[PDB]
Design an enzyme around this catalytic site. Sequence first.
Site, PDB file in Angstrom:
ATOM      1  N   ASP A  92      -6.625   8.282  -0.559  1.00  0.00           N
ATOM      2  CA  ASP A  92      -6.323   7.152   0.375  1.00  0.00           C
ATOM      3  C   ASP A  92      -5.285   7.718   1.319  1.00  0.00           C
ATOM      4  O   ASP A  92      -4.308   8.502   0.922  1.00  0.00           O
ATOM      5  CB  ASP A  92      -5.475   6.133  -0.472  1.00  0.00           C
ATOM      6  CG  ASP A  92      -6.906   5.395  -1.360  1.00  0.00           C
ATOM      7  OD1 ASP A  92      -7.680   5.195  -0.866  1.00  0.00           O
ATOM      8  OD2 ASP A  92      -6.224   5.036  -2.527  1.00  0.00           O
ATOM      9  N   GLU A 106       0.807  -1.299  -0.056  1.00  0.00           N
ATOM     10  CA  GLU A 106       0.007  -0.037  -0.055  1.00  0.00           C
ATOM     11  C   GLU A 106       0.872   1.424  -0.021  1.00  0.00           C
ATOM     12  O   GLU A 106       0.632   2.211  -0.563  1.00  0.00           O
ATOM     13  CB  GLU A 106      -1.013  -0.030   1.065  1.00  0.00           C
ATOM     14  CG  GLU A 106      -2.079  -0.810   1.228  1.00  0.00           C
ATOM     15  CD  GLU A 106      -3.330  -0.661  -0.066  1.00  0.00           C
ATOM     16  OE1 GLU A 106      -3.030   0.361  -0.441  1.00  0.00           O
ATOM     17  OE2 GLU A 106      -3.906  -1.606  -0.170  1.00  0.00           O
ATOM     18  N   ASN A 142      -9.083   4.592   2.862  1.00  0.00           N
ATOM     19  CA  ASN A 142      -9.852   5.515   1.881  1.00  0.00           C
ATOM     20  C   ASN A 142     -11.021   6.288   2.668  1.00  0.00           C
ATOM     21  O   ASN A 142     -11.586   5.899   3.656  1.00  0.00           O
ATOM     22  CB  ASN A 142     -10.654   4.748   0.839  1.00  0.00           C
ATOM     23  CG  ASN A 142     -11.376   5.358  -0.188  1.00  0.00           C
ATOM     24  OD1 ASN A 142     -12.450   5.630  -0.368  1.00  0.00           O
ATOM     25  ND2 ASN A 142     -10.493   5.851  -1.349  1.00  0.00           N
ATOM     26  N   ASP A 156     -13.367   8.956  -8.276  1.00  0.00           N
ATOM     27  CA  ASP A 156     -14.443   8.846  -7.377  1.00  0.00           C
ATOM     28  C   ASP A 156     -14.335  10.175  -6.413  1.00  0.00           C
ATOM     29  O   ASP A 156     -14.930  10.146  -5.678  1.00  0.00           O
ATOM     30  CB  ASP A 156     -14.697   7.737  -6.767  1.00  0.00           C
ATOM     31  CG  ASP A 156     -13.662   7.280  -5.606  1.00  0.00           C
ATOM     32  OD1 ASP A 156     -12.608   7.979  -5.614  1.00  0.00           O
ATOM     33  OD2 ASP A 156     -14.456   6.592  -4.603  1.00  0.00           O
ATOM     34  N   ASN A 198      -7.524   9.684  -5.541  1.00  0.00           N
ATOM     35  CA  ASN A 198      -8.448   8.867  -6.576  1.00  0.00           C
ATOM     36  C   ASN A 198      -9.392   9.726  -7.492  1.00  0.00           C
ATOM     37  O   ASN A 198     -10.608  10.109  -7.104  1.00  0.00           O
ATOM     38  CB  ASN A 198      -9.251   7.842  -6.181  1.00  0.00           C
ATOM     39  CG  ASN A 198      -8.374   6.969  -5.165  1.00  0.00           C
ATOM     40  OD1 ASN A 198      -7.472   6.443  -5.723  1.00  0.00           O
ATOM     41  ND2 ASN A 198      -8.660   6.830  -3.706  1.00  0.00           N
ATOM     42  N   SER A 249     -12.157  10.440  -3.782  1.00  0.00           N
ATOM     43  CA  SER A 249     -11.759  10.134  -2.570  1.00  0.00           C
ATOM     44  C   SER A 249     -10.357  10.204  -2.462  1.00  0.00           C
ATOM     45  O   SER A 249      -9.651  10.182  -3.447  1.00  0.00           O
ATOM     46  CB  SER A 249     -12.314   8.668  -2.327  1.00  0.00           C
ATOM     47  OG  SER A 249     -11.526   7.803  -3.095  1.00  0.00           O
TER      48      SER A 249
END
Length: 130
Positions: free
Chosen positions: A53, A35, A60, A49, A46, A51
């Site tokens: 991380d 990750e 998220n 959408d 991102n 969002s």
Amino acid sequence: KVFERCELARTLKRLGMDGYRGISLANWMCLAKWESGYNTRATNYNAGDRSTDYGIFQINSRYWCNDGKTPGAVNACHLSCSALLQDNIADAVACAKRVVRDPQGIRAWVAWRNRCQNRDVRQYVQGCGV
């Protein structure tokens, strides 16, 4: 901060992650490795959408923490996403435990399916005294 491999393994063990809801320390290690490269300060936006991380587990904002700027989002860990960018990973570990209390468990993270699931993950904890 960027953790050394074995330092992180011991840090997660102290925080009760070994075997938490069936998940071995080596699986958590493999998750953090892929990750973030064991990096607590990482954020990834991102565009798809809207969002983001956050942190060492790349948790998220749509579901898990509040950053105010993700449409329709909820905050199941009840934390500011800021809490997931600390050097101290206590809050990030509490939130990771919250994620895996849901049905998917560790499958919640796609990188774990890609990089860890059904693999020999013993190397992540080799020599760490855990």
